[PDB]
Amino acid sequence: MGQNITARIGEPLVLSCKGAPKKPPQQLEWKLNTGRTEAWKVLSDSVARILPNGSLLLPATGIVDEGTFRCRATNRRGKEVKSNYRVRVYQIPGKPEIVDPASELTASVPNKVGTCVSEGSYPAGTLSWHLDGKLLIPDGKETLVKEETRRHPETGLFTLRSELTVIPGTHPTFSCSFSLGLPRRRPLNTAPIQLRVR
Amino acid sequence: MGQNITARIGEPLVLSCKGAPKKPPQQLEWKLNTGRTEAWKVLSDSVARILPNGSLLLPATGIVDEGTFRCRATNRRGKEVKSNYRVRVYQIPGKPEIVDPASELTASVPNKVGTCVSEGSYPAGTLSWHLDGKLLIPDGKETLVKEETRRHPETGLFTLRSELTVIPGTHPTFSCSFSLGLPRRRPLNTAPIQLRVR
Amino acid sequence: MGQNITARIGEPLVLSCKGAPKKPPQQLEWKLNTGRTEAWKVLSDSVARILPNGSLLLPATGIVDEGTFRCRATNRRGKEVKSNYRVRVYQIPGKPEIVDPASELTASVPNKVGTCVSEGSYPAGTLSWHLDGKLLIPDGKETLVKEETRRHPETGLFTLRSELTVIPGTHPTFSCSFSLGLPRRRPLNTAPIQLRVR
Amino acid sequence: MGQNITARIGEPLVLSCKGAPKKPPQQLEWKLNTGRTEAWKVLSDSVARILPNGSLLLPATGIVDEGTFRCRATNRRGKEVKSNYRVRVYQIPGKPEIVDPASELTASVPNKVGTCVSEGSYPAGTLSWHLDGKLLIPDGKETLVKEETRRHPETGLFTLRSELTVIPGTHPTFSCSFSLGLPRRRPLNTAPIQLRVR
Amino acid sequence: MGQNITARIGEPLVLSCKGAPKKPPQQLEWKLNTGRTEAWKVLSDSVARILPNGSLLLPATGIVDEGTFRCRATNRRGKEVKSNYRVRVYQIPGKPEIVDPASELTASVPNKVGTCVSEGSYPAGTLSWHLDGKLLIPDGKETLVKEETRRHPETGLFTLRSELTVIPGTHPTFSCSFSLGLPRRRPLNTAPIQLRVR
Amino acid sequence: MGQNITARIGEPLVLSCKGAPKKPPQQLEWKLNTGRTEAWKVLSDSVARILPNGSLLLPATGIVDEGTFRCRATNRRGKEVKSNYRVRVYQIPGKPEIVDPASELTASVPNKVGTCVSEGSYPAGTLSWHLDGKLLIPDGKETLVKEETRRHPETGLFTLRSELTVIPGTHPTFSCSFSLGLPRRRPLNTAPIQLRVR
């Protein structure tokens, strides 16, 4: 059950090879499929390095380290041991913040309440508003929300924004929460396609 | 409860610092007390190295890596976070073996049965014999055992030997087991003394 | 006039020391004040490294490399030569984009036209709109604009947003331009203060 | 006569290439056959490294460094120079020790005198006892000796043990000596075979 | 016009690749033709190293770094960008010196005036004498000069010597100047031939 | 007798420390006085590096590596062992060559015979001529020789030149030999002085 790894971006990861001798000499090779990999990388540093015990070391994991990590090693008994890991990664964004807040609302007409912003998450996750602590669902009348998620190409992290409009009453309290989109375990994805736009 | 670490010799260990920023710049220093340390080592490679996230990395742990690992880091909020680990280590020896076995015993007199040998353990652990599966206790008459533990100065690992003599009967079966001396958690030791022999 | 350097983030920079011998041995030391520096760094790698000719090398410049770079070297004639550089840095953001555009406007009432977004600049620079190619100034009636600049703490880069509202007519064309805030040369800044908020 | 090298384990070895230019550029390649080598290693670090003068450097020699070291280099005159070394290695064990000694012997019956132990030799070498300084040969009656040599798989070094039994007299003195098995020069060995045990 | 580089020996050189992404991952390879290269070197350290932005770094340029530097990179838009540099190098020699000077000349006969020496130039450049500040041309009678240029095989640098003989008058002043042979731009050379001397 | 080392420039040198343990941990420090050293260097790479056995490694020795190499080490028995080496260095120059030779001599007047040149020696050594194999001494009449030794500041190596003039006879043969100035062992030198020239 432990061939799937979830790892926070920035932090080291060690992947063991089982069957590698505790110390050199060792017959082993690692082959990787990542965001960095064209097809497959192969070795026997600060990118990826092999420890004395044959384990694989990534000094600080990033989105580009997601994918398949495989080892093949000739074991001390002379035959081959296989290792197969799937690495997924995540980032927790900063505290969410409410920008452009209204100080006063006028009952019976629509008002821009504010925008909730989360900066720097992976994967995107979602934002939602509460009013006096209950989840608000958008309707077409008394409420509507425009949300934008935009990804930073220089880091791969996401920014969410959620802008609330309401048509009201007396004295309500509001707040926003960010729920990361991570599930329990392993979602399954097709290989990607890339059509051209004419 | 996790400031104590037990680690198998040969294998990498990562110790986190809590409070270090996820990435550089960081104000932090590690200070170590080990078998290598005279008093205290200090840094901010293949001996000991600091990862991008500020964590401490030992590429392959050995007996000489036992001791105290401390971090002090100036946290992102501006004040100081402390880390304190105690590292202990172990090695599993090879399969035990019986050497110099007797093919035949003569009832009513003492016979050298054989020596059970374990090679390459840390800490020493112990050897014990079974006869038809039950633990044998030594007595002064029908049985006696001479045992020797000797440590390799070039590796720190131990060799145990246990030589059985018996005074017997019909048709008994014998075998030896090695029980490592590791307990659950944390034994407590005085600082050592070193008197001179006149 | 060349003691000030402007350098694009990501790219290498070489700073010469004048007076250093063309090759070793050399008596010289570099001392740095940067975003990384607490007070002053000192040396005689991928952070900062000294080349064979005594020059200073930064392998990929970033915002954290802004500041003062000083060399002191004992010259071939036996006396001392001083070097003093001031490094400033920049990033060009991605192409600006218009998000949430309106397809139709109604004359005589205010309409949300769209938001112009620039992602990933340093320093921030500014956004401005044109209508049929002329600069629009905001007024209080026929036009107003809300703009937000937000900085990414994990990279130091900025995101600008500019949201246009208009009160109109027949058939206008719109577009937005991003003007980086860099000037010709050397603006001068006070040392910073950091009061506490009660 | 100097193409054979004998080297103590732990210590550096430099092997020259003759014909390599005193400095770069150089056309040369080293190919090795060792305990580490599957077939042949090839290069033009702390495992094996090439010095500026083209010589081969092993930072600390071990049993695994035994074998064939070959260089081929394109010489300054344009044609090829060949180098061929055979490396053999050794370790001196610790002082021998006598364990389990008897304080008293009874004349006319056999007595276990003691075990002489040597720890940490390569190659094994041998142990022998003296009584009042003369070599003892084993017989079947007045003396017999059981000896064991056991090799440490984690280091390749050997432990010898020699257990003396005697059938005596008045007042003899005993002592043991360790004679390393190294000869003058170059013993010759067949390539090994490895049959299977059914 | 900037695909030709002239660089002083000893000093670093950075060659950019255009089209390489500002940061990793990048698909690119450098191939070099130099004095070090047999045919072509290829990579994706202190010899030649690739910076984070994909640029090529030579830590201290020498005569052996003259030649062709090519990059091929898969650009961020997915297709290929080519780079092509031609590197030439130079060294300024030391101050010229006059050796073996005559204190007195006798009119009407030839006298050895002195030798002007320049040490350590690349390319060779030339020496010439002035008498009361005017260029002297050699004739067959009143003047003649023997000059020697000799190159140091261990460095590639040149030594020039120029020995003046004159047939004189009253009170002339003499001095020598060294004019480096560098031109403006790019001389063009055939590929070399190497006939054998019988 | 082996605390003095003579080493050819360009080639590696290993200096042992005696008393250092065969392997880490070790308490030792090296302190050096060389052409590179201002006063004394201290350590516990390609400049100078310490091997696993505690020995000192210079990867390619040069004139700048001449001087005093000292080790101090805390030995396995707990007390201190001292090491003290004196390193001297040399270079063999290229084959000597005769330049500017005369094809014909006229008896009864002086003739410039030729210059013998040696390039690239350390220490300087000397040049001498033979005529039909016998050493020529200079006189004031039938022979005289002007010799020049000039040192390359960029390498420290020497160039010798020896220019022969003779006043002759029938059919003599000439040749020149270079005799390096190295003696057997250890010349002794005062510490240097450096007066100023007014």
Residues in Cβ contact with D186 at an 8 Å cutoff, skipping those fewer than 6 apart: D4, D86
Token match 């093949």: residue?
Answer: A72
Question: Alpha-carbon torsion D62, D64, D66, D70, what sign?
Answer: negative
- Which residue, among D147, D149, D162, has the nearest Cα to D117 in the 3D structure? D162
- CB contact under 8 Å between B12 and A57, yes or no, is yes
The residue type found at C50 is: I
Cβ-Cβ pairs closer than 8 A, A with C, add up to 31
Token match 């450097």: residue?
Answer: D57
Residue A92 contacts B, CB cutoff 8 Å: no
Sheet holding F80-90, edge to edge: F4-8, F80-90, F67-74, F27-33, F41-43
B33 neighbors B65 (Cβ within 8 angstroms): no
- Which residue, among B28, F88, E54, E38, has the nearest Cα to B15 in the 3D structure? B28
Question: Alpha-carbon torsion B42, B44, B49, B54, what sign?
Answer: positive
> In this complex, does chain A touch chain F, defined as having at least 3 beta-carbon pairs under 8 Å apart?
no
Class (C level, CATH) for F1-92? mainly beta
SS (H, E, C) chain A: CCCEEEEECCCCEEECCCCCCCCCCCEEEEEEECCCCCCCEEECCCCCEECCCCCEEECCCCHHHCEEEEEEEECCCCCEEEEEEEEEEEECCCCCEEECCCCCCCCCCCEEEEEEEEEEEECCCEEEEEECCEECCCCCCCEEEEEEEEECCCCCCEEEEEEEEECCCCCCCEEEEEECCCCCCCCCCCCCCCCCCC
- What's the CATH superfamily of F93-181? Immunoglobulins (2.60.40.10)
Residue E172 contacts D, CB cutoff 8 Å: no
| Tokens, residue B82 | 């402390």
List, as ranges, residues 69-88 from D with C-beta within 8 Å of B.
Answer: none
Closest in C23, C25, C27 to F35, CB measured: C25
Residue C13, SS3 per DSSP: strand
SS (H, E, C) D3-26: CEEEEECCCCEEECCCCCCCCCCC
- Which residue, among A132, A116, A89, has the nearest Cα to A178 in the 3D structure? A116
Length of chain C, in residues: 198
- Closest residue, chain C, to E54 (C-alpha): C11
C12 neighbors C51 (Cβ within 8 angstroms): no
Residue D175, SS3 per DSSP: strand
| Tokens, residue C136 | 């629009």
Cβ-Cβ pairs closer than 8 A, B with F, add up to 6
Q: What residue ranges do the domains of chain E occupy?
A: 1-92, 93-181
Token match 């035994």: residue?
Answer: D66
- Closest residue, chain A, to E27 (C-alpha): A38
Residue F65, SS3 per DSSP: helix
E76 neighbors E54 (Cβ within 8 angstroms): no
Distance CA E112, CA F141 (A): 19
b (16+ CB within 10 A) / e for E21-32: bbeeebebebeb
- Closest residue, chain A, to B52 (C-alpha): A60
b (16+ CB within 10 A) / e for A160-192: bbbbbebeeeeeeebebebebeeeeeeeeeeee
Q: DSSP class of residue F122? A: B
Residues in Cβ contact with C131 at an 8 Å cutoff, skipping those fewer than 6 apart: C172, C173, C174
Distance CA D125, CA D159 (A): 10
Distance CA B35, CA B156 (A): 11
Method by which the coordinates were obtained? X-ray
Q: Which helix (H) or strand (E) holds F162?
A: strand F158-166
- Which residue, among B84, B67, B101, B111, has the nearest Cα to B18 in the 3D structure? B84
Q: How far is CA F16 from CA D59, F22, F28, in A?
A: 13, 11, 12
Phi, psi of B39 (to 5 degrees): -115, -80
- Which residue, among B131, B126, B128, has the nearest Cα to B166 in the 3D structure? B131
- Which residue, among E46, E71, E43, E42, has the nearest Cα to E59 in the 3D structure? E46
Chain breaks of chain F after residues with C–N above 2.5 Å? 44, 168
SS (H, E, C) chain B: CCCEEEEECCCCEEECCCCCCCCCCCEEEEEEECCCCCCCEEECCCCCEECCCCCEEECCCCHHHCEEEEEEEECCCCCEEEEEEEEEEEECCCCCEEECCCCCCCCCCCEEEEEEEEEEEECCCEEEEEECCEECCCCCCCEEEEEEEEECCCCCCEEEEEEEEECCCCCCCEEEEEECCCCCCCCCCCCCCCCCCC
Cα distance between the two ends of chain D? 45
Question: Alpha-carbon torsion A137, A138, A144, A149, what sign?
Answer: positive
Residue C51 contacts E, CB cutoff 8 Å: yes
B71 neighbors B40 (Cβ within 8 angstroms): no
- CB contact under 8 Å between D36 and A25, yes or no, is yes
- CB contact under 8 Å between C14 and E12, yes or no, is yes
Cα distance between the two ends of chain E? 45
The strand pair at E174-179 and F4-8 is best described as unpaired
Which residues on F lie below 8 Å from D52 (Cβ)? 10, 12, 59-60
- CB contact under 8 Å between D148 and B99, yes or no, is yes
E158 neighbors E150 (Cβ within 8 angstroms): yes
- CB contact under 8 Å between F23 and B154, yes or no, is yes
E61 neighbors E103 (Cβ within 8 angstroms): no
Distance CA F122, CA F92 (A): 7
b (16+ CB within 10 A) / e for D96-109: bebeeeeeeeeeee
D1-92 and D93-181 have identical folds: yes
- CA B116, distance to chain mean position in Å, is 20
- CB contact under 8 Å between E25 and A154, yes or no, is no
What phi-psi label fits residue A132: left (phi over 0), alpha (psi between -120 and 50 degrees) or beta?
Answer: left
For residue E132, list its beta bridge partners.
none
The residue type found at C94 is: G
Token match 């120059």: residue?
Answer: F93
- CB contact under 8 Å between F53 and D12, yes or no, is yes
Question: Exposed/middle/buried for A101, CB within 10 Å: 0-12, 13-18, 19+?
Answer: exposed
Residue E183 contacts A, CB cutoff 8 Å: no
- CB contact under 8 Å between F27 and B35, yes or no, is no
Question: Alpha-carbon torsion D22, D24, D25, D28, what sign?
Answer: positive
Query: Resolution (in Å) of the shown entry?
Result: 3.5
Residue D65, SS3 per DSSP: helix
The DSSP result for D156-169, as a single string, is --EEEEEEEEE---
Residue A38 contacts E, CB cutoff 8 Å: yes
- Closest residue, chain C, to F37 (C-alpha): C25
- Closest residue, chain D, to F11 (C-alpha): D53
| Tokens, residue F153 | 């500041």
Token match 């016009």: residue?
Answer: E1
| Tokens, residue F25 | 């941990």
Length of chain E, in residues: 198
The Cβ of residue B176 has, within 10 Å, a number of other Cβ atoms equal to: 20
- Which residue, among D164, D166, D136, has the nearest Cα to D148 in the 3D structure? D164
> In this complex, does chain F touch chain E, defined as having at least 3 beta-carbon pairs under 8 Å apart?
yes
- Closest residue, chain F, to C27 (C-alpha): F38
Dihedral through CA D117, CA D120, CA D121, CA D122, nearest 10? 150
Residue F63, SS3 per DSSP: helix
Distance CA B157, CA B150 (A): 9
The strand pair at E13-15 and A97-99 is best described as unpaired
Q: How far is CA B145 from CA A122, D98, D165, in A?
A: 64, 19, 18
Give CB contacts under 8 A, 24+ apart, made by A131-140: A131/A172, A131/A173, A131/A174, A132/A172, A132/A173, A133/A175
Cα distance between the two ends of chain A? 45
Q: Which helix (H) or strand (E) holds D118?
A: strand D111-121
Residue D150 contacts B, CB cutoff 8 Å: yes
